[PDB]
Amino acid sequence: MYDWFSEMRKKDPVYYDGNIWQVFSYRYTKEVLNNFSKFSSDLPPLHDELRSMSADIFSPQKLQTLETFIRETTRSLLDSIDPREDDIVKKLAVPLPIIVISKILGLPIEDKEKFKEWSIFELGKKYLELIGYVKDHLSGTEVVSRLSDIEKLGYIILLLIAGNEATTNLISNSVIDFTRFNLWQRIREENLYLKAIEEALRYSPPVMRTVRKTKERVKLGDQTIEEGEYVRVWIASANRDEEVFHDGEKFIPDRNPNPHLSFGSLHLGAPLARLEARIAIEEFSKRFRHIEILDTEKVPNEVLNGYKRLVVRLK
Ligand code: HEM
Protein backbone atom coordinates (compact mmCIF):
# COMPACT_ATOMS: atom_id res chain seq x y z
CA MET A 1 0.00 0.00 0.00
CA TYR A 2 2.78 2.44 0.93
CA ASP A 3 4.87 1.62 -2.17
CA TRP A 4 1.86 2.69 -4.24
CA PHE A 5 1.78 5.95 -2.28
CA SER A 6 5.52 6.48 -2.91
CA GLU A 7 5.12 6.27 -6.69
CA MET A 8 1.94 8.37 -6.76
CA ARG A 9 3.65 11.09 -4.71
CA LYS A 10 6.54 10.93 -7.19
CA LYS A 11 4.58 10.75 -10.46
CA ASP A 12 0.96 11.85 -9.78
CA PRO A 13 0.44 13.76 -6.48
CA VAL A 14 -3.11 14.72 -7.51
CA TYR A 15 -4.61 11.86 -9.52
CA TYR A 16 -7.86 11.08 -11.37
CA ASP A 17 -8.52 7.40 -12.13
CA GLY A 18 -11.78 8.02 -14.03
CA ASN A 19 -14.02 7.49 -11.00
CA ILE A 20 -12.66 9.68 -8.19
CA TRP A 21 -9.90 12.20 -7.45
CA GLN A 22 -7.15 11.04 -5.08
CA VAL A 23 -4.47 13.10 -3.32
CA PHE A 24 -1.22 11.60 -2.02
CA SER A 25 1.32 14.32 -1.14
CA TYR A 26 1.43 16.35 2.08
CA ARG A 27 1.08 19.84 0.61
CA TYR A 28 -2.09 19.07 -1.37
CA THR A 29 -3.53 16.81 1.36
CA LYS A 30 -3.07 19.65 3.87
CA GLU A 31 -4.59 22.22 1.49
CA VAL A 32 -7.73 20.15 0.83
CA LEU A 33 -8.43 19.62 4.55
CA ASN A 34 -7.69 23.17 5.75
CA ASN A 35 -9.16 25.12 2.82
CA PHE A 36 -12.74 24.48 3.97
CA SER A 37 -14.20 27.16 1.68
CA LYS A 38 -13.15 25.44 -1.56
CA PHE A 39 -13.46 21.87 -0.24
CA SER A 40 -16.56 20.89 1.75
CA SER A 41 -17.05 18.29 4.49
CA ASP A 42 -20.74 18.08 3.52
CA LEU A 43 -21.50 15.04 1.36
CA PRO A 44 -22.53 23.65 11.65
CA PRO A 45 -24.35 24.50 14.91
CA LEU A 46 -24.39 20.74 15.58
CA HIS A 47 -20.63 20.89 15.01
CA ASP A 48 -20.30 24.03 17.17
CA GLU A 49 -22.33 22.34 19.92
CA LEU A 50 -19.91 19.41 19.69
CA ARG A 51 -16.97 21.82 19.90
CA SER A 52 -18.62 23.59 22.85
CA MET A 53 -19.12 20.30 24.70
CA SER A 54 -15.62 19.08 23.80
CA ALA A 55 -14.28 22.21 25.52
CA ASP A 56 -16.32 21.44 28.65
CA ILE A 57 -15.52 17.72 29.07
CA PHE A 58 -12.11 17.47 27.34
CA SER A 59 -10.51 20.49 29.03
CA PRO A 60 -6.86 20.20 30.10
CA GLN A 61 -7.92 20.51 33.76
CA LYS A 62 -10.65 17.86 33.40
CA LEU A 63 -8.28 15.46 31.62
CA GLN A 64 -5.54 16.17 34.18
CA THR A 65 -8.08 15.24 36.87
CA LEU A 66 -8.78 11.93 35.10
CA GLU A 67 -5.12 10.87 34.77
CA THR A 68 -5.18 8.81 37.98
CA PHE A 69 -8.51 7.17 37.12
CA ILE A 70 -7.23 6.24 33.65
CA ARG A 71 -4.03 4.82 35.17
CA GLU A 72 -5.86 2.64 37.71
CA THR A 73 -8.35 1.48 35.07
CA THR A 74 -5.44 0.55 32.78
CA ARG A 75 -3.69 -1.07 35.75
CA SER A 76 -6.83 -3.08 36.59
CA LEU A 77 -7.25 -4.17 32.96
CA LEU A 78 -3.66 -5.44 32.74
CA ASP A 79 -4.19 -7.63 35.83
CA SER A 80 -6.75 -9.71 33.91
CA ILE A 81 -4.22 -10.47 31.14
CA ASP A 82 -2.78 -13.98 30.79
CA PRO A 83 1.01 -13.57 30.39
CA ARG A 84 1.36 -16.94 28.60
CA GLU A 85 -1.06 -16.04 25.80
CA ASP A 86 -3.72 -13.33 25.55
CA ASP A 87 -5.31 -10.76 23.22
CA ILE A 88 -4.22 -7.12 23.71
CA VAL A 89 -7.16 -5.76 21.69
CA LYS A 90 -9.75 -7.55 23.83
CA LYS A 91 -8.06 -6.95 27.20
CA LEU A 92 -6.69 -3.40 26.87
CA ALA A 93 -7.27 -1.57 23.58
CA VAL A 94 -11.07 -1.94 23.41
CA PRO A 95 -11.98 -1.67 27.12
CA LEU A 96 -9.91 1.33 28.29
CA PRO A 97 -11.40 3.95 25.93
CA ILE A 98 -14.97 2.77 26.66
CA ILE A 99 -14.49 2.73 30.44
CA VAL A 100 -12.93 6.21 30.29
CA ILE A 101 -15.65 7.75 28.09
CA SER A 102 -18.24 6.08 30.35
CA LYS A 103 -16.68 7.88 33.34
CA ILE A 104 -16.81 11.18 31.42
CA LEU A 105 -20.36 10.73 30.11
CA GLY A 106 -21.51 9.11 33.37
CA LEU A 107 -22.60 5.84 31.76
CA PRO A 108 -23.32 2.98 34.18
CA ILE A 109 -20.40 0.65 34.94
CA GLU A 110 -20.58 -2.95 36.21
CA ASP A 111 -23.68 -4.96 35.19
CA LYS A 112 -25.24 -2.29 32.95
CA GLU A 113 -21.86 -1.56 31.31
CA LYS A 114 -21.82 -5.02 29.73
CA PHE A 115 -25.36 -4.51 28.39
CA LYS A 116 -24.93 -0.83 27.44
CA GLU A 117 -21.72 -1.52 25.50
CA TRP A 118 -23.41 -4.18 23.35
CA SER A 119 -26.30 -1.85 22.44
CA ILE A 120 -36.97 -0.15 17.09
CA PHE A 121 -39.16 0.91 20.02
CA GLU A 122 -37.34 -1.26 22.57
CA LEU A 123 -34.09 0.15 21.16
CA GLY A 124 -35.56 3.66 21.36
CA LYS A 125 -36.29 3.19 25.07
CA LYS A 126 -32.64 2.28 25.70
CA TYR A 127 -31.57 5.19 23.47
CA LEU A 128 -33.50 7.55 25.77
CA GLU A 129 -32.12 5.81 28.88
CA LEU A 130 -28.65 6.34 27.40
CA ILE A 131 -29.34 10.06 26.90
CA GLY A 132 -30.76 10.23 30.44
CA TYR A 133 -27.42 9.16 31.91
CA VAL A 134 -25.52 11.98 30.19
CA LYS A 135 -28.32 14.43 31.01
CA ASP A 136 -28.07 13.62 34.73
CA HIS A 137 -24.26 13.76 34.84
CA LEU A 138 -23.74 17.07 33.00
CA SER A 139 -22.56 22.10 29.02
CA GLY A 140 -24.88 23.82 26.54
CA THR A 141 -26.37 20.74 24.87
CA GLU A 142 -27.06 18.99 28.20
CA VAL A 143 -28.67 22.07 29.77
CA VAL A 144 -30.82 22.86 26.71
CA SER A 145 -32.72 19.58 27.23
CA ARG A 146 -32.82 19.74 31.04
CA LEU A 147 -37.11 17.18 20.58
CA SER A 148 -34.56 18.34 18.00
CA ASP A 149 -32.33 19.28 20.95
CA ILE A 150 -32.78 15.76 22.38
CA GLU A 151 -31.86 14.10 19.06
CA LYS A 152 -28.90 16.48 18.76
CA LEU A 153 -27.62 15.38 22.18
CA GLY A 154 -28.19 11.70 21.37
CA TYR A 155 -26.26 12.18 18.13
CA ILE A 156 -23.26 13.76 19.87
CA ILE A 157 -23.20 11.05 22.55
CA LEU A 158 -22.98 8.37 19.85
CA LEU A 159 -20.12 10.29 18.21
CA LEU A 160 -18.16 10.71 21.46
CA ILE A 161 -18.41 6.94 22.03
CA ALA A 162 -17.77 5.97 18.40
CA GLY A 163 -14.57 8.01 18.05
CA ASN A 164 -12.85 5.80 20.63
CA GLU A 165 -12.41 3.05 18.00
CA ALA A 166 -9.50 5.01 16.49
CA THR A 167 -7.94 5.33 19.96
CA THR A 168 -8.28 1.56 20.32
CA ASN A 169 -6.48 1.20 16.98
CA LEU A 170 -3.73 3.65 17.98
CA ILE A 171 -2.95 1.57 21.07
CA SER A 172 -2.81 -1.65 19.03
CA ASN A 173 -0.74 -0.07 16.25
CA SER A 174 1.66 1.33 18.87
CA VAL A 175 2.15 -2.11 20.43
CA ILE A 176 2.86 -3.60 17.00
CA ASP A 177 5.24 -0.82 15.95
CA PHE A 178 7.30 -0.65 19.17
CA THR A 179 7.58 -4.46 19.24
CA ARG A 180 8.59 -4.93 15.59
CA PHE A 181 11.17 -2.13 15.77
CA ASN A 182 12.25 -3.20 19.28
CA LEU A 183 11.77 0.22 20.89
CA TRP A 184 10.27 -0.64 24.31
CA GLN A 185 13.50 -0.49 26.33
CA ARG A 186 14.58 2.64 24.45
CA ILE A 187 11.23 4.41 24.90
CA ARG A 188 11.22 3.38 28.56
CA GLU A 189 14.82 4.42 29.28
CA GLU A 190 14.69 7.66 27.24
CA ASN A 191 11.09 8.66 28.06
CA LEU A 192 9.90 8.77 24.44
CA TYR A 193 6.29 7.82 25.24
CA LEU A 194 4.89 11.14 24.00
CA LYS A 195 6.91 11.27 20.76
CA ALA A 196 6.62 7.52 20.09
CA ILE A 197 2.82 7.75 20.22
CA GLU A 198 2.97 10.66 17.75
CA GLU A 199 5.29 8.65 15.51
CA ALA A 200 2.81 5.76 15.72
CA LEU A 201 0.12 8.25 14.65
CA ARG A 202 2.22 9.38 11.68
CA TYR A 203 3.42 5.91 10.70
CA SER A 204 0.26 3.90 11.46
CA PRO A 205 -2.67 6.34 11.30
CA PRO A 206 -5.96 4.81 12.60
CA VAL A 207 -7.84 6.77 9.91
CA MET A 208 -6.09 6.03 6.62
CA ARG A 209 -8.02 8.55 4.52
CA THR A 210 -10.89 11.04 4.39
CA VAL A 211 -13.11 12.64 1.74
CA ARG A 212 -13.91 16.19 0.61
CA LYS A 213 -16.34 17.59 -1.97
CA THR A 214 -15.37 20.49 -4.25
CA LYS A 215 -17.53 23.53 -3.45
CA GLU A 216 -16.30 25.33 -6.58
CA ARG A 217 -14.05 24.78 -9.61
CA VAL A 218 -10.49 24.73 -8.24
CA LYS A 219 -6.95 23.91 -9.38
CA LEU A 220 -4.52 21.79 -7.35
CA GLY A 221 -0.99 21.11 -8.62
CA ASP A 222 -0.86 20.59 -12.38
CA GLN A 223 -4.46 19.31 -12.33
CA THR A 224 -7.80 21.16 -12.34
CA ILE A 225 -10.94 19.67 -10.76
CA GLU A 226 -14.56 20.71 -11.38
CA GLU A 227 -17.40 21.36 -8.91
CA GLY A 228 -19.24 18.43 -7.33
CA GLU A 229 -16.15 16.21 -7.59
CA TYR A 230 -15.24 14.12 -4.54
CA VAL A 231 -11.57 14.36 -3.51
CA ARG A 232 -10.11 11.34 -1.72
CA VAL A 233 -7.34 12.45 0.64
CA TRP A 234 -4.79 9.81 1.64
CA ILE A 235 -3.65 10.86 5.11
CA ALA A 236 -1.45 7.75 5.35
CA SER A 237 0.39 8.83 2.19
CA ALA A 238 0.79 12.46 3.28
CA ASN A 239 2.39 11.24 6.52
CA ARG A 240 5.15 9.46 4.54
CA ASP A 241 6.00 12.45 2.31
CA GLU A 242 9.79 12.72 2.01
CA GLU A 243 9.94 16.52 1.71
CA VAL A 244 8.14 17.02 5.03
CA PHE A 245 9.29 13.83 6.77
CA HIS A 246 12.98 13.06 6.21
CA ASP A 247 13.47 9.29 6.25
CA GLY A 248 9.67 9.13 6.01
CA GLU A 249 9.58 5.33 5.67
CA LYS A 250 11.64 4.96 8.86
CA PHE A 251 10.03 4.67 12.31
CA ILE A 252 11.82 7.24 14.47
CA PRO A 253 10.34 7.21 18.00
CA ASP A 254 12.02 10.50 18.99
CA ARG A 255 11.00 12.28 15.76
CA ASN A 256 10.42 15.96 16.54
CA PRO A 257 8.58 17.94 15.32
CA ASN A 258 6.03 15.52 13.85
CA PRO A 259 3.38 17.49 11.91
CA HIS A 260 1.31 14.48 10.83
CA LEU A 261 -2.23 14.91 9.50
CA SER A 262 -3.64 11.82 11.26
CA PHE A 263 -6.30 13.92 13.04
CA GLY A 264 -7.25 15.64 9.78
CA SER A 265 -8.16 19.34 9.55
CA LEU A 266 -8.46 21.09 15.62
CA HIS A 267 -9.73 17.57 16.36
CA LEU A 268 -11.81 17.51 19.55
CA GLY A 269 -10.91 14.16 21.14
CA ALA A 270 -7.22 14.30 20.19
CA PRO A 271 -5.96 15.27 23.65
CA LEU A 272 -8.12 12.47 25.11
CA ALA A 273 -6.88 9.89 22.61
CA ARG A 274 -3.26 10.91 23.22
CA LEU A 275 -3.67 10.72 27.00
CA GLU A 276 -5.35 7.29 26.94
CA ALA A 277 -2.67 5.87 24.62
CA ARG A 278 0.20 7.44 26.58
CA ILE A 279 -1.04 5.92 29.85
CA ALA A 280 -1.93 2.61 28.18
CA ILE A 281 1.61 2.13 26.85
CA GLU A 282 3.31 3.40 30.02
CA GLU A 283 1.53 0.93 32.32
CA PHE A 284 1.76 -1.90 29.77
CA SER A 285 5.51 -1.38 29.30
CA LYS A 286 6.03 -1.62 33.08
CA ARG A 287 4.49 -5.11 33.26
CA PHE A 288 6.39 -6.58 30.28
CA ARG A 289 10.17 -6.76 30.10
CA HIS A 290 9.63 -8.81 26.92
CA ILE A 291 6.82 -8.94 24.32
CA GLU A 292 6.37 -11.75 21.76
CA ILE A 293 3.74 -11.47 19.02
CA LEU A 294 2.07 -14.80 18.22
CA ASP A 295 -0.92 -14.06 15.98
CA THR A 296 -2.56 -11.01 14.38
CA GLU A 297 -5.77 -10.24 12.49
CA LYS A 298 -6.26 -6.92 10.70
CA VAL A 299 -9.60 -5.10 10.62
CA PRO A 300 -11.22 -5.78 7.23
CA ASN A 301 -11.42 -2.15 6.08
CA GLU A 302 -9.51 -0.06 3.53
CA VAL A 303 -10.34 3.13 5.47
CA LEU A 304 -9.35 2.05 8.99
CA ASN A 305 -5.89 0.96 10.14
CA GLY A 306 -6.11 -1.35 13.15
CA TYR A 307 -6.31 -4.88 14.55
CA LYS A 308 -9.26 -7.13 15.38
CA ARG A 309 -6.88 -9.52 17.16
CA LEU A 310 -3.39 -9.00 18.56
CA VAL A 311 -2.30 -12.10 20.49
CA VAL A 312 0.88 -11.68 22.53
CA ARG A 313 3.06 -13.40 25.11
CA LEU A 314 4.63 -11.37 27.92
CA LYS A 315 7.56 -12.11 30.24
C1 HEM B 1 -6.26 8.05 17.65
C2 HEM B 1 -7.48 8.56 17.79
C3 HEM B 1 -8.22 9.29 16.73
C4 HEM B 1 -7.88 9.55 15.42
C5 HEM B 1 -6.62 9.13 14.71
C6 HEM B 1 -8.95 10.30 14.85
C7 HEM B 1 -8.95 10.72 13.52
C8 HEM B 1 -9.98 11.44 12.93
C9 HEM B 1 -9.97 11.92 11.60
C10 HEM B 1 -8.87 11.74 10.58
C11 HEM B 1 -11.14 12.57 11.40
C12 HEM B 1 -11.56 13.26 10.13
C13 HEM B 1 -11.27 14.76 10.27
C14 HEM B 1 -11.24 15.44 8.93
O1 HEM B 1 -11.73 14.88 7.92
O2 HEM B 1 -10.72 16.57 8.82
C15 HEM B 1 -11.88 12.51 12.60
C16 HEM B 1 -13.12 13.08 12.78
C17 HEM B 1 -13.75 13.02 14.02
N1 HEM B 1 -13.33 12.43 15.16
FE1 HEM B 1 -11.68 11.56 15.43
N2 HEM B 1 -9.90 10.49 15.76
C18 HEM B 1 -9.55 9.92 16.92
C19 HEM B 1 -10.24 9.87 18.13
C20 HEM B 1 -11.49 10.45 18.34
C21 HEM B 1 -12.16 10.50 19.58
C22 HEM B 1 -11.64 9.90 20.87
C23 HEM B 1 -13.35 11.18 19.38
C24 HEM B 1 -14.42 11.52 20.35
C25 HEM B 1 -14.39 11.22 21.64
C26 HEM B 1 -13.39 11.54 18.00
C27 HEM B 1 -14.39 12.25 17.39
C28 HEM B 1 -14.31 12.64 16.06
C29 HEM B 1 -15.42 13.39 15.47
C30 HEM B 1 -16.70 13.80 16.16
C31 HEM B 1 -15.08 13.63 14.19
C32 HEM B 1 -15.92 14.37 13.17
C33 HEM B 1 -16.03 15.86 13.54
C34 HEM B 1 -14.68 16.50 13.74
O3 HEM B 1 -13.75 16.30 12.93
O4 HEM B 1 -14.48 17.25 14.73
N3 HEM B 1 -12.26 11.07 17.39
N4 HEM B 1 -11.17 11.79 13.52
Side-chain angles (χ1 to χ4, degrees), residues 33 41 58 101 159-164 166-168 170 201 205-207 209-212 235 261-265 267 269-270 272-274 276:
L33 301 176
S41 294
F58 306 133
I101 197 63
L159 262 45
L160 295 168
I161 297 169
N164 294 116
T167 305
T168 290
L170 177 54
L201 275 164
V207 180
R209 69 192 200 193
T210 184
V211 182
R212 288 288 200 280
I235 290 159
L261 310 171
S262 300
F263 285 106
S265 181
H267 183 286
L272 178 76
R274 287 188 171 105
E276 274 165 15

Coordinates of all heavy atoms in Angstrom, one line a residue, residues 33 41 50 58 101 159-164 166-168 170 201 205-207 209-212 235 261-270 272-274 276, ligand 1, unseen atoms left out:
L33 N -7.8 19.7 3.2 CA -8.4 19.6 4.6 C -8.6 21.0 5.2 O -9.7 21.2 5.8 CB -7.6 18.7 5.5 CG -7.3 17.3 5.0 CD1 -6.4 16.6 6.0 CD2 -8.6 16.5 4.9
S41 N -16.9 19.5 3.7 CA -17.0 18.3 4.5 C -18.4 17.7 4.3 O -18.7 16.5 4.5 CB -16.8 18.5 6.0 OG -15.5 18.9 6.2
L50 N -20.9 20.4 19.4 CA -19.9 19.4 19.7 C -18.6 20.0 20.2 O -18.1 19.6 21.2 CB -19.6 18.6 18.4
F58 N -13.5 17.8 27.7 CA -12.1 17.5 27.3 C -11.2 18.6 27.6 O -10.2 18.8 26.8 CB -12.0 17.0 25.9 CG -12.9 15.9 25.5 CD1 -13.6 15.9 24.3 CD2 -13.0 14.7 26.3 CE1 -14.5 14.9 24.0 CE2 -13.8 13.7 26.0 CZ -14.6 13.7 24.8
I101 N -14.5 6.9 28.6 CA -15.6 7.8 28.1 C -16.9 7.6 28.9 O -17.7 8.5 29.1 CB -15.9 7.5 26.6 CG1 -16.8 8.6 26.0 CG2 -16.6 6.2 26.4 CD1 -16.1 10.0 26.0
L159 N -21.4 9.9 18.8 CA -20.1 10.3 18.2 C -19.0 10.2 19.2 O -17.9 9.6 18.9 CB -20.2 11.7 17.7 CG -20.4 11.9 16.2 CD1 -21.6 11.0 15.7 CD2 -20.8 13.4 15.9
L160 N -19.2 10.7 20.4 CA -18.2 10.7 21.5 C -17.8 9.3 21.9 O -16.6 9.0 22.2 CB -18.6 11.5 22.7 CG -18.9 13.0 22.5 CD1 -19.6 13.6 23.7 CD2 -17.5 13.7 22.3
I161 N -18.7 8.4 21.8 CA -18.4 6.9 22.0 C -17.7 6.3 20.8 O -16.7 5.6 21.0 CB -19.7 6.2 22.4 CG1 -20.3 6.7 23.7 CG2 -19.4 4.7 22.5 CD1 -21.7 6.1 23.9
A162 N -18.2 6.6 19.6 CA -17.8 6.0 18.4 C -16.3 6.3 18.1 O -15.6 5.5 17.5 CB -18.7 6.3 17.2
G163 N -15.9 7.6 18.4 CA -14.6 8.0 18.1 C -13.5 7.2 18.7 O -12.3 7.2 18.3
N164 N -13.8 6.6 19.8 CA -12.8 5.8 20.6 C -12.3 4.5 19.9 O -11.4 3.9 20.4 CB -13.5 5.4 22.0 CG -13.7 6.6 22.9 OD1 -14.9 6.9 23.2 ND2 -12.7 7.4 23.2
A166 N -10.8 4.6 17.0 CA -9.5 5.0 16.5 C -8.4 5.0 17.6 O -7.3 4.7 17.3 CB -9.6 6.4 15.9
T167 N -8.8 5.4 18.8 CA -7.9 5.3 20.0 C -7.5 3.9 20.3 O -6.4 3.6 20.6 CB -8.6 6.0 21.2 OG1 -9.0 7.3 20.9 CG2 -7.6 6.0 22.4
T168 N -8.5 3.0 20.2 CA -8.3 1.6 20.3 C -7.2 1.1 19.3 O -6.3 0.4 19.6 CB -9.6 0.8 20.2 OG1 -10.4 1.0 21.3 CG2 -9.3 -0.7 20.0
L170 N -5.0 3.0 17.7 CA -3.7 3.6 18.0 C -2.9 2.9 19.0 O -1.7 2.7 18.9 CB -3.9 5.1 18.5 CG -2.7 5.9 18.8 CD1 -1.6 5.8 17.7 CD2 -3.0 7.3 19.2
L201 N 1.2 7.5 15.4 CA 0.1 8.2 14.7 C 0.5 8.5 13.2 O -0.3 8.3 12.3 CB -0.3 9.5 15.4 CG -1.3 9.4 16.5 CD1 -1.3 10.7 17.4 CD2 -2.7 9.1 16.0
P205 N -1.5 5.5 11.0 CA -2.7 6.3 11.3 C -4.0 5.5 11.3 O -4.3 4.9 10.3 CB -2.7 7.4 10.2 CG -2.1 6.7 9.0 CD -1.0 5.8 9.6
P206 N -4.7 5.5 12.5 CA -6.0 4.8 12.6 C -7.0 5.1 11.5 O -7.7 4.2 11.0 CB -6.5 5.3 13.9 CG -5.3 5.6 14.7 CD -4.3 6.2 13.7
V207 N -7.0 6.4 11.1 CA -7.8 6.8 9.9 C -6.9 7.0 8.7 O -6.1 7.9 8.7 CB -8.6 8.1 10.2 CG1 -9.5 8.4 9.0 CG2 -9.5 7.9 11.4
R209 N -7.6 7.6 5.5 CA -8.0 8.6 4.5 C -9.3 9.3 4.9 O -10.0 8.9 5.9 CB -8.2 7.9 3.2 CG -9.4 6.9 3.1 CD -9.4 6.0 1.9 NE -10.8 5.5 1.6 CZ -11.0 4.5 0.8 NH1 -10.0 3.9 0.1 NH2 -12.3 4.1 0.6
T210 N -9.6 10.3 4.2 CA -10.9 11.0 4.4 C -11.3 11.7 3.1 O -10.5 11.7 2.1 CB -10.8 12.1 5.5 OG1 -12.0 12.7 5.7 CG2 -9.8 13.2 5.1
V211 N -12.5 12.2 3.0 CA -13.1 12.6 1.7 C -13.5 14.1 1.8 O -14.0 14.6 2.9 CB -14.3 11.8 1.3 CG1 -14.9 12.2 0.0 CG2 -13.9 10.3 1.3
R212 N -13.4 14.8 0.7 CA -13.9 16.2 0.6 C -14.6 16.4 -0.7 O -14.4 15.6 -1.7 CB -12.8 17.2 0.7 CG -12.2 17.4 2.1 CD -13.1 18.1 3.0 NE -12.4 18.7 4.2 CZ -12.0 18.0 5.3 NH1 -12.3 16.7 5.4 NH2 -11.4 18.6 6.2
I235 N -4.4 10.4 4.0 CA -3.6 10.9 5.1 C -2.4 10.0 5.3 O -1.3 10.5 5.6 CB -4.5 10.9 6.4 CG1 -5.6 12.0 6.3 CG2 -3.7 11.1 7.6 CD1 -6.8 11.8 7.2
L261 N -0.9 14.5 9.8 CA -2.2 14.9 9.5 C -3.2 13.8 9.9 O -4.3 13.7 9.3 CB -2.4 15.3 8.0 CG -1.3 16.3 7.5 CD1 -1.5 16.4 6.0 CD2 -1.5 17.6 8.2
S262 N -2.8 13.0 10.8 CA -3.6 11.8 11.3 C -5.0 12.2 11.9 O -5.9 11.5 11.8 CB -2.9 11.0 12.3 OG -1.7 10.5 11.7
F263 N -5.0 13.4 12.5 CA -6.3 13.9 13.0 C -7.1 14.8 12.1 O -8.2 15.2 12.4 CB -6.0 14.7 14.3 CG -5.7 13.9 15.5 CD1 -4.4 13.8 16.0 CD2 -6.7 13.1 16.1 CE1 -4.1 13.0 17.1 CE2 -6.3 12.3 17.2 CZ -5.0 12.2 17.7
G264 N -6.5 15.0 10.9 CA -7.3 15.6 9.8 C -7.1 17.1 9.8 O -5.9 17.6 9.9
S265 N -8.2 17.9 9.7 CA -8.2 19.3 9.6 C -7.2 20.0 10.5 O -7.5 20.3 11.7 CB -9.6 19.9 9.8 OG -9.6 21.3 9.7
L266 N -9.0 22.0 14.6 CA -8.5 21.1 15.6 C -9.4 20.0 16.0 O -10.6 20.2 16.1 CB -8.1 21.9 16.9
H267 N -8.9 18.7 16.1 CA -9.7 17.6 16.4 C -10.0 17.5 17.9 O -9.1 17.7 18.7 CB -9.0 16.3 15.9 CG -9.8 15.0 16.1 ND1 -9.9 14.5 17.3 CD2 -10.4 14.2 15.2 CE1 -10.6 13.4 17.2 NE2 -10.9 13.2 15.9
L268 N -11.3 17.3 18.2 CA -11.8 17.5 19.5 C -11.3 16.5 20.6 O -10.9 16.9 21.7 CB -13.3 17.5 19.5
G269 N -11.3 15.2 20.2 CA -10.9 14.2 21.1 C -9.5 13.7 21.0 O -9.1 12.7 21.4
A270 N -8.6 14.6 20.4 CA -7.2 14.3 20.2 C -6.4 14.3 21.5 O -5.6 13.4 21.7 CB -6.6 15.3 19.2
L272 N -7.6 13.7 24.4 CA -8.1 12.5 25.1 C -7.5 11.2 24.6 O -7.0 10.4 25.4 CB -9.6 12.4 25.0 CG -10.3 11.2 25.6 CD1 -10.4 11.4 27.1 CD2 -11.7 10.9 25.0
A273 N -7.5 11.1 23.3 CA -6.9 9.9 22.6 C -5.4 9.8 23.0 O -5.0 8.7 23.4 CB -7.0 10.0 21.1
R274 N -4.7 10.9 22.9 CA -3.3 10.9 23.2 C -3.0 10.5 24.7 O -2.1 9.7 24.9 CB -2.7 12.3 23.0 CG -2.5 12.7 21.5 CD -1.8 14.0 21.4 NE -1.4 14.3 20.0 CZ -2.0 15.2 19.2 NH1 -3.0 15.9 19.6 NH2 -1.6 15.3 18.0
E276 N -5.0 8.7 26.8 CA -5.3 7.3 26.9 C -4.2 6.4 26.4 O -3.8 5.5 27.1 CB -6.7 7.0 26.2 CG -7.9 7.2 27.1 CD -9.2 7.2 26.3 OE1 -9.2 6.8 25.2 OE2 -10.2 7.7 26.9
Ligands
HEM1 C1 -6.3 8.1 17.6 C2 -7.5 8.6 17.8 C3 -8.2 9.3 16.7 C4 -7.9 9.5 15.4 C5 -6.6 9.1 14.7 C6 -8.9 10.3 14.9 C7 -8.9 10.7 13.5 C8 -10.0 11.4 12.9 C9 -10.0 11.9 11.6 C10 -8.9 11.7 10.6 C11 -11.1 12.6 11.4 C12 -11.6 13.3 10.1 C13 -11.3 14.8 10.3 C14 -11.2 15.4 8.9 O1 -11.7 14.9 7.9 O2 -10.7 16.6 8.8 C15 -11.9 12.5 12.6 C16 -13.1 13.1 12.8 C17 -13.8 13.0 14.0 N1 -13.3 12.4 15.2 FE1 -11.7 11.6 15.4 N2 -9.9 10.5 15.8 C18 -9.5 9.9 16.9 C19 -10.2 9.9 18.1 C20 -11.5 10.4 18.3 C21 -12.2 10.5 19.6 C22 -11.6 9.9 20.9 C23 -13.4 11.2 19.4 C24 -14.4 11.5 20.3 C25 -14.4 11.2 21.6 C26 -13.4 11.5 18.0 C27 -14.4 12.2 17.4 C28 -14.3 12.6 16.1 C29 -15.4 13.4 15.5 C30 -16.7 13.8 16.2 C31 -15.1 13.6 14.2 C32 -15.9 14.4 13.2 C33 -16.0 15.9 13.5 C34 -14.7 16.5 13.7 O3 -13.7 16.3 12.9 O4 -14.5 17.2 14.7 N3 -12.3 11.1 17.4 N4 -11.2 11.8 13.5

